[PDB]
Design a protein around this ligand. Structure first.
Ligand code: CHL
Ligand code: CLA
Ligand code: CLA
Ligand code: CLA
Ligand code: CLA
Ligand code: CLA
Ligand code: CLA
Ligand code: CLA
Ligand SMILES: CC(/C=C/C=C(C)/C=C/[C@@]12O[C@]1(C)C[C@@H](O)CC2(C)C)=C\C=C\C=C(C)\C=C\C=C(C)\C=C\[C@@]12O[C@]1(C)C[C@@H](O)CC2(C)C
Ligand SMILES: CC(/C=C/C=C(C)/C=C/[C@@]12O[C@]1(C)C[C@@H](O)CC2(C)C)=C\C=C\C=C(C)\C=C\C=C(C)\C=C\[C@@]12O[C@]1(C)C[C@@H](O)CC2(C)C
Lengths: 197, 217, 113, 41, 226, 224
């Protein structure tokens, strides 16, 4: 029932058995009650997918030699015409904000109208163009792998935010510096993350 | 745990409302407070929170003063707020009101758990039912007791007695901190080193305060 | 002296400031804050006092020896009615609407003619 | 305690408490707002 | 039952315990909703205040957001009337206020008439033939031409969910407009500028930092700084 | 049984009377280890304090003895942090502090999880597969990678003799590091220098001469 277990030998969770991607966890007992646990499941999958999109939007523009991710939305301050993948979209920040608000409002309104809890978790159909998870065991394995990569991308996005709050240097340059100088380039060397070095 | 228990004064009659069930019940009550069960519950909760805050503050003061005497650049426990908001990114006004906003939730949850026991643990706060339920009057438990050595009743009683005794000791320690910092204008660790350096001379009678000197003869 | 000036206060022939009491005239010359706003505030507070006293009079009469409650005040009840009087005009006009604010002339102690 | 509380619940004691409360409120208002006459925000 | 509790561990009022009206949380500490007709009038007044608050907050934020973004050039809400009344084609302030008062007098008189007698505005032949759908389905929910898209013609569970969403966004909007007035009086700037100030510098731009909101805290701040 | 008495003629505590563990001498005037769970916690804490004190006294004495023999140029322990922070390959103090904190937090978390439930780290596949051999045979003595050369599968008498030797040398190391701290706070020199001065002049190398140790004794010393 448990894919894994952090801190092996911990107290077993009688309320987290059939959950996909379950590594026991929750020492704060936040997963009690079925409705709250289901709502937290929806929040966890949605936040993992949004962390996927954020990590994609960071790393794809970082490794393509187009700039960092902090200066990417700064053109609204500058007013210079944006560029995406060399397609050179002429849209304006007022129109962009309006269409984004309308589109995400109607999309999340449609998502909130899922009736069934499992359909709110994984609807399929139009959202599954090929559907490799037709097999139930393959479905469970894909759900576990999606949750694992989502948690890893969540940690990556939090690291992006913290690193770019500490220093303006890009995270791929941070990885290069940690490879070149591990013991002389880390969060303790900045002195801002932890006071008193 | 009652009846023939050590009291605040040997031979004094213990109060009727102080049967010895509470932790640290030495039958000490000259003013006959906490006679009513609700007043007793309020006094127990107030003593527990004052004890916890006193122990936390005295431990922080002692750690900062010990580090300052060792060589770390730490200010004295008195007037530490001045240099604190001189170097704080958060100025005064915003910091104290942010602290009040952060404290209001915990304080009102404590108050309405004291008034209504077990009412907080009903899924109202982020869907928590088993947790956030007060095990005793002033002893909530739950997520505030992550490791469960309070599950045993005798161990829980001994922990309660130890906690209330160390709390009263820290109350007197904080009062002593205030008094001998107003008297000597030095750190409590400085007073300790002065007392263990010349015990026969350095005391509460040679500071020029506490005992007044008028004739000087 | 600086605050009395540049605040709409006016004085006649003696330097002692004068207050305009007629509404409308005080509204079109920015003198409403002299007496118009304070009189409304005092009416609000006086209605608070009256509503709290009425609530304590009514709520301490359906019990044995109401004079004992009158002479020895129920402090938690008094404080509860104190903190529940913030909406005195709403409750007052609602009691007027349902007729419980006023007593009929048949249950009222009356002097002989 | 409850007998002393009912003594404090008597009318002169609660009237005294109201007197100190109202007097202190008005005095602190007058002290921190020195001599106002007209409501001007 | 009840949607939630505004104050956990506190006893709910008796009139609010078994009540099933949407947007209920037991928040009657002053016990004003004890009477049923008074509760109905309070619910209708809350609906009206909330709806006009949502309209006002939208008209403050969305044009304000577009102006701070740069596409729009409409003024901020706290001076828009003054600059508009200075226009060369401006309708006079008295004329606009009188027309607003007359139109709102007609509308609120119709609302009063359908409140004091429910469904009484459907009297035949009283408003150009189109008075048939001018009836009150519920307290504060007339329907008909007020619901031309037919979104309210849904199962009662979804209708109750929509009512809960309406009253919650409404209460948020009244709190938001109270904030608009309050920290316009405090900061003297637009709400979008205040949001940008709080985002850029959260600690230094706080309601306790300025002395307008909390008088005397600034004196304590300079006392501690000295 | 018991390995002896800390004080002959003194009555053994009831919880220390009929127990079975290494290094038992009845030394508990305060009866702190009355609770068996508290006794296990105190035993584990004493074991880890003794082990880190053994490492401390080893790194203080053996490089110090090599320095006194002229083989090495290792400085004293009370300035070695300042020596390393000023070196050419000076890793910053913060980086080393956080690395040590993270590694020791992981180690202490694993040890605490093994202490709360004995043998609970032997669940299959949690830690690279080999964690099935991480089961703690005794509280504080897991074995396995901790003893790869194989001195644990000996006779039980040999096992308790080795445990008693470990406890005795550990307690000696703890009092040795307490002496190192006291001698640095009073004499201000290295422990090897103190030992050399005690060998050269036993009477002059005494803490009675130092006024930091016994205040007022030097007053009597110069009074005569
Ligand atoms: C737990 C309660 C508490 C106590 C007993 C103290 C104690 C003290 N504070 Mg600290 N503080 C407390 C509240 C808090 N203070 C501060 C932050 C400050 C500052 C910034 C200042 C002190 C000040 C002082 C001094 C008051 C001198 C006085 O009143 O003489 C009459 C003294 C060292 C003052 C100080 O340090 O000067 C002596 C001062 O200006 N306090 C914060 C966080 C914002 C508090 C939170 O509750
Ligand atoms: C780590 C990546 C990952 C993985 C393994 C899955 C896996 C799954 N999701 Mg999910 N999904 C993801 C990310 C991921 N998702 C993200 C980021 C979003 C938001 C855009 C969604 C949105 C989403 C919806 C809305 C639905 C699913 C569904 C599914 C299932 C379909 C399985 C299948 O046919 O393809 C197997 C999976 C793969 C082959 C992964 C390929 C990923 C490519 C390589 C990423 C390329 C990115 C590129 C470099 C830029 C399965 C459980 C459906 C479901 O379970 O319904 C029953 C469903 O309804 N997912
Ligand atoms: C609009 C009316 C209103 C008012 C005045 C309050 C006021 C309060 N609520 Mg409440 N609350 C409200 C609506 C309201 N709430 C709604 C609509 C919900 C959703 C059901 C909640 C859910 C809620 C929870 C879950 C909790 C509070 C709590 C609190 C207290 C926090 C005290 C503090 O320092 O906060 C700053 C305070 C008395 C806390 C409390 O009192 O705990 C006992 C708490 O835990 N509230
Ligand atoms: C009965 C008491 C009383 C008296 C003697 C006055 C007297 C006055 N009022 Mg006032 N007034 C009163 C009560 C009173 N007011 C009340 C209760 C209100 C409603 C809040 C008003 C609202 C009012 C307005 C709106 C105006 C006056 C004006 C006036 C002036 C001329 C009135 C007129 O007919 O010409 C005069 C100084 C007018 C004024 O200032 O002079 C042009 C004016 O515009 N009054
Ligand atoms: C009944 C007539 C009357 C009226 C209308 C006033 C009205 C006023 N007097 Mg006066 N006064 C009166 C009788 C009266 N007083 C009497 C009988 C005495 C002698 C005991 C005094 C002695 C007196 C002194 C010595 C002073 C005043 C002051 C004031 C001001 C109120 C300041 C205050 O309370 O803080 C304001 C408090 C509040 C607004 C309460 C707010 C509470 C909540 C928030 C509502 C105001 C202009 C003071 C002033 O500013 O002079 C102009 C002042 O210095 N008066
Ligand atoms: C000023 C407009 C206004 C009005 C008329 C109401 C009226 C009402 N609200 Mg509401 N409320 C408002 C603003 C308002 N609210 C705002 C701004 C908030 C957010 C801070 C709330 C938060 C709130 C909660 C959380 C709850 C109510 C409830 C109620 C009812 C209580 C009736 C009462 O005590 O007398 C009306 C009060 C006055 C006229 C003053 C009534 C339907 C309760 C309810 O639904 O019970 C029926 C309830 O649970 N309201
Ligand atoms: C409660 C509803 C409400 C109210 C009372 C107002 C009031 C006002 N708006 Mg409007 N407005 C609203 C909602 C509201 N707004 C909404 C929901 C939007 C769409 C987001 C707008 C969009 C809007 C624009 C685009 C403009 C106004 C303007 C104005 C002002 C002059 C009226 C005019 O010329 O109309 C028009 C006036 C202060 C004008 C103005 O002076 O700018 C602030 C103007 O140019 N409004
Ligand atoms: C008891 C002392 C006291 C006094 C006299 C005031 C007075 C005021 N405050 Mg303040 N306030 C106080 C304590 C006080 N406050 C405390 C303790 C807090 C923290 C909860 C606040 C939080 C606060 C906010 C958040 C706001 C005010 C605002 C206001 C104004 C509203 C009245 C008005 O202008 O009409 C006024 C200047 C409002 C303001 O700035 O008016 C424009 C406003 O937005 N106050
Ligand atoms: C922090 C966070 C959640 C944290 C949750 C925590 C700690 C949970 C706590 C607990 O588990 C613990 C610890 C232990 C348990 O005892 C208790 C619980 C309670 C179980 C979510 C953030 C979630 C954050 C999210 C989703 C952020 C998404 C951001 C996006 C998409 C941004 C877009 C852009 O990045 C692009 C794409 C390209 C760029 O150029 C431009 C921009 C605009 C910057
Ligand atoms: C002693 C004390 C109370 C004593 C009460 C007594 C004797 C009461 C006696 C009686 O009731 C009995 C028994 C029985 C009754 O019949 C009779 C009476 C007579 C009524 C409380 C102290 C209570 C003391 C407390 C709670 C201390 C808290 C300390 C904190 C929070 C410290 C915070 C700091 O801010 C500082 C101050 C300065 C910064 O430099 C550092 C930091 C850490 C920031």
């Amino acid at each position: 029932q448990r894919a894994g277990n952090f801190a092996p030998g911990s107290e077993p969770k009688e309320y987290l058995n059939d959950l996909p991607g379950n590594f026991n966890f929750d020492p704060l007992e936040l997963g009690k009650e079925k409705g709250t646990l289901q709502r937290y499941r929806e929040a966890e999958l949605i936040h993992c997918r949004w962390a996927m999109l954020g990590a994609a939007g960071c790393l794809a523009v970082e490794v393509l030699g187009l700039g960092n991710w902090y200066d990417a939305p700064l053109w609204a301050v500058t007013g210079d015409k944006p560029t995406w993948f060399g397609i050179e979209v002429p849209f304006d920040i007022a129109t962009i904000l309006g269409v984004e608000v309308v589109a995400m409002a109607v999309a999340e309104g449609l998502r909130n109208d899922n009736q069934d809890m499992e359909k709110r978790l994984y609807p399929g159909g139009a959202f599954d163009p090929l559907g490799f998870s037709k097999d139930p065991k393959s479905f469970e394995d894909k759900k576990l792998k999606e949750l694992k990569n989502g948690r890893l991308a969540m940690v990556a996005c939090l690291g992006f935010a913290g690193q770019h709050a500490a220093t303006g240097k890009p995270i791929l340059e941070a990885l290069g510096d940690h490879l070149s100088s591990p013991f002389f380039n880390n969060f303790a060397t900045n002195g801002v993350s932890v006071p008193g070095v | 745990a009652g009846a023939d228990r050590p009291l605040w004064s040997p031979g004094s009659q213990p109060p009727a409302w102080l049967d010895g069930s509470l932790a640290g019940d030495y039958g000490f009550d000259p003013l006959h407070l906490s006679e009513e069960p609700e007043m007793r519950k309020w006094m127990v909760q107030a003593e527990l929170v004052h004890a916890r805050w006193a122990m936390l503050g005295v431990a922080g003061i002692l750690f900062t003063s010990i580090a300052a005497k060792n060589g770390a650049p730490f200010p004295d426990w008195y007037d530490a707020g001045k240099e604190a908001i001189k170097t704080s990114p958060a100025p005064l006004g915003s910091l104290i009101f942010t602290e009040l906003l952060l404290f209001g939730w915990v304080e009102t949850k404590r108050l309405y758990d004291l008034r209504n026991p077990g009412s907080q643990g009903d899924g109202s706060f982020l869907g928590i039912t088993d947790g956030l339920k007060g095990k005793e009057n002033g002893y909530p438990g739950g997520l505030f007791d992550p490791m469960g050595m309070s599950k045993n009743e005798a161990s829980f009683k001994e922990a309660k007695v130890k906690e209330i005794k160390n709390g009263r000791l820290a109350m007197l320690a904080f009062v002593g901190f205030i008094a001998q910092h107003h008297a000597t204008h030095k750190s409590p660790i400085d007073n300790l080193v002065d007392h263990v350096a010349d015990p026969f001379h350095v005391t509460f009678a040679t500071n020029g305060v506490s005992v007044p000197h008028f004739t000087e003869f | 002296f600086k605050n009395y000036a540049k605040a709409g206060l006016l004085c006649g022939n003696d330097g002692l400031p004068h207050l305009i009491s007629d509404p409308g005239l005080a509204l079109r010359f920015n003198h409403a804050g002299e007496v118009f706003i304070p009189t409304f505030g005092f009416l609000y507070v006086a209605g608070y006092i009256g509503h709290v006293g009425r609530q304590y009079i009514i709520k301490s009469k359906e019990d044995a020896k109401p004079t004992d409650k009158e002479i020895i005040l129920d402090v938690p009840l008094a404080l509860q009615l104190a903190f529940q009087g913030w909406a005195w005009p709403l409750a007052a006009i609602q009691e007027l609407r349902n007729g419980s604010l006023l007593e009929k002339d048949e249950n009222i102690t009356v002097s002989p003619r | 305690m409850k007998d002393f509380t009912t003594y404090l619940s008597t009318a002169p004691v609660v009237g005294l408490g109201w007197a100190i409360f109202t007097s202190g409120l008005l005095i602190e208002i007058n002290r921190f707002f020195p001599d106002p006459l007209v409501f001007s925000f | 039952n009840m949607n939630g509790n505004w104050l956990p561990g506190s006893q709910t009022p008796a009139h609010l315990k078994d009540l099933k009206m949407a947007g209920n949380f037991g928040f009657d500490p002053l016990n004003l909703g004890a009477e049923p007709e008074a509760l109905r009038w309070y619910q209708q007044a809350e609906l009206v205040h909330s709806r006009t608050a949502m309209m006002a907050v939208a008209g403050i934020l969305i044009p304000g957001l577009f102006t701070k973004l740069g596409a729009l050039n409409v003024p901020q809400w706290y001076e828009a009337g003054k600059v508009y009344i200075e226009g060369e084609g401006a309708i006079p302030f008295g004329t606009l206020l009188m027309s607003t008062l007359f139109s709102y007098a007609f509308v609120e008189g119709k609302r009063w008439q359908d409140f004091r007698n429910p469904g009484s505005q459907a009297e035949p032949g009283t408003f150009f033939g189109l008075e048939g759908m001018f009836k009150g389905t519920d307290n504060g929910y007339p329907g008909g031409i007020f619901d031309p898209l037919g979104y309210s013609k849904t199962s009662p569970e979804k209708l109750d969910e929509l009512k809960l969403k309406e009253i919650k966004n409404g209460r948020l909007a009244m709190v938001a407009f109270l904030g608009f007035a309050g920290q316009y009086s405090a900061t003297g700037k637009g709400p979008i500028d205040n949001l940008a100030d709080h985002l850029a510098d959260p600690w230094h731009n706080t309601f306790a930092e300025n002395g307008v909101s909390v008088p005397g805290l600034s004196a304590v701040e300079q006392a501690a700084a000295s």
